């Protein structure tokens, strides 16, 4: 919630200029909506499959037709409300700032200059792979890249021999305002994926519907994010779109609970675990101590021995 972020050089140091937050990072983070949108968006790049039309006669039979011949007209793509999809992207963008989320997904960002990490626009003008990799070394995302590079494993499924042989983790995401050969330079290094600010792919944003991929920004892209999503000051550049509101202003509930004035208005609390009373029943008519927590007359009753009392001879 700080106002501004120091841009960093390609050599990697606090450049004296700083940029205000684009207020997109103040968006509500709704992982339920990100999840529901992510399922339907992940269902988009799908090719259909089917069994043969006519190609005994039993589902139980060897070589017969199967039960439920899989037909093509089963639904493949899923229609999504456009504001809802934009809302999921906005929650993803706001989640990328936090970086407890980025560590919570699994990234090696423990030695990076700050969050959200912003580099100069000169990064865009790099057109060779080794220079851009050395630039990310100078940033400090080297450990994330080494994680991705070590993480190349072979797929456990049958889909290994369905052209999906290798698998590995995902790494940094570089956001540029404009290509100047950067997307060719980072194409060869694994785990890195670039994105114009106009697109900002949700699948690239929250992979596996887990919020907060490690995202690197260029300087012009970070300014351009205000153009892309708007603010209370800049309009939206999207037709009739608004960065959506919160239903609760303060993100911390325990701050509100422990503030001062709720703490004034509230009755005193219990022990925070219940003091067990009467864990076991001790019978009277024996155990004379629990007989004496009852009926204090019983002591002088036994003292006078009235149970054996001799009556008058009258």
């Amino acid at each position: 919630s700080r106002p501004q972020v120091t841009v960093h050089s390609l050599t990697g140091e606090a450049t004296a200029n700083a940029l205000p937050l684009p207020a997109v990072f103040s968006a509500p983070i709704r992982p339920d909506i990100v999840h529901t949108v992510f399922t339907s968006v992940n269902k988009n790049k799908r090719q259909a499959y089917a069994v043969s039309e006519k190609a005994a006669f039993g589902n139980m039979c060897r070589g017969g037709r199967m039960f439920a011949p899989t037909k093509t007209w089963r639904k493949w793509n899923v229609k999504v409300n456009h504001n809802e999809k934009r809302y999921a992207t906005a929650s993803a963008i706001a989640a990328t700032a936090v970086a407890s989320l980025v560590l919570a997904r699994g990234h090696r960002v423990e030695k990076i200059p700050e969050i959200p990490l912003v580099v100069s626009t000169d990064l865009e003008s790099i057109q060779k792979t080794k220079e851009a990799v050395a630039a990310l070394k100078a940033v400090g995302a080297h450990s994330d890249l080494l994680k991705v590079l070590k993480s190349k494993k072979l797929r456990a499924g049958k889909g290994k021999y369905r052209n999906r042989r290798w698998t590995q983790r995902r790494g940094p995401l570089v956001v540029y305002a404009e290509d100047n050969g950067i997307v060719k330079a980072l194409r060869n290094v694994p785990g890195v994926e670039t994105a114009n600010v106009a697109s900002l792919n949700l699948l690239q944003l929250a992979p596996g519907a887990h919020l907060g991929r490690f995202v690197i920004w260029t300087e012009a892209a970070f300014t351009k994010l205000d153009q892309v999503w708007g603010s209370e000051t800049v309009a939206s550049s999207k037709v009739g779109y608004t960065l959506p509101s919160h239903i609760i202003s303060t993100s911390d509930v325990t701050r509100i609970i422990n503030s001062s004035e709720i703490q004034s208005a509230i009755r005193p609390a219990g022990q925070a675990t219940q003091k067990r009373t009467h864990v076991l029943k001790k019978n009277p008519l024996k155990n004379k101590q629990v007989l004496l927590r009852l009926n204090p007359y019983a002591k002088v009753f036994a003292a006078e021995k009235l149970g054996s009392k001799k009556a008058e001879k009258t």
Binding site: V98, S100, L103, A104, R105, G106, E114, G140, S251, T254
Partner: protein, 101 residues
């Protein structure tokens, strides 16, 4: 944001969290003092934090402030603990003065 970050970590994927056969959860967070992944336990869900942790020989107290939520390279503060057991516990109580139990 800490309770939002916590409910993301809890109800969705905490990458460090390991599920026991018992049902209990375990963060592989290197700064986590207890082994568990609970509300007090995740260093990711809490901005005031502390941890006894050893680098090659010497044991260091690691302090985490909300003041440095950004800049995670400069996040952890390091204190060299004494080899005197009593003195180092006293040092803990000093640096965690006015701090939670």
């Amino acid at each position: 944001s800490d309770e939002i970050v916590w409910q993301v970590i809890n109800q969705s994927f905490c990458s460090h969290r390991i599920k026991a056969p018992n049902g209990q959860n375990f963060c592989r967070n290197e700064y986590n003092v207890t082994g568990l992944c609970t509300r007090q336990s995740c260093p990711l869900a809490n901005s005031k934090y502390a941890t006894v942790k050893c680098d090659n020989g010497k044991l260091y107290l690691y302090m985490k402030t909300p003041e440095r939520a950004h800049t995670p390279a400069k996040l952890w503060e390091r204190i060299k603990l004494s080899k005197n057991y009593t003195k180092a516990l006293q040092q803990i109580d000093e640096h965690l003065l006015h701090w939670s139990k």
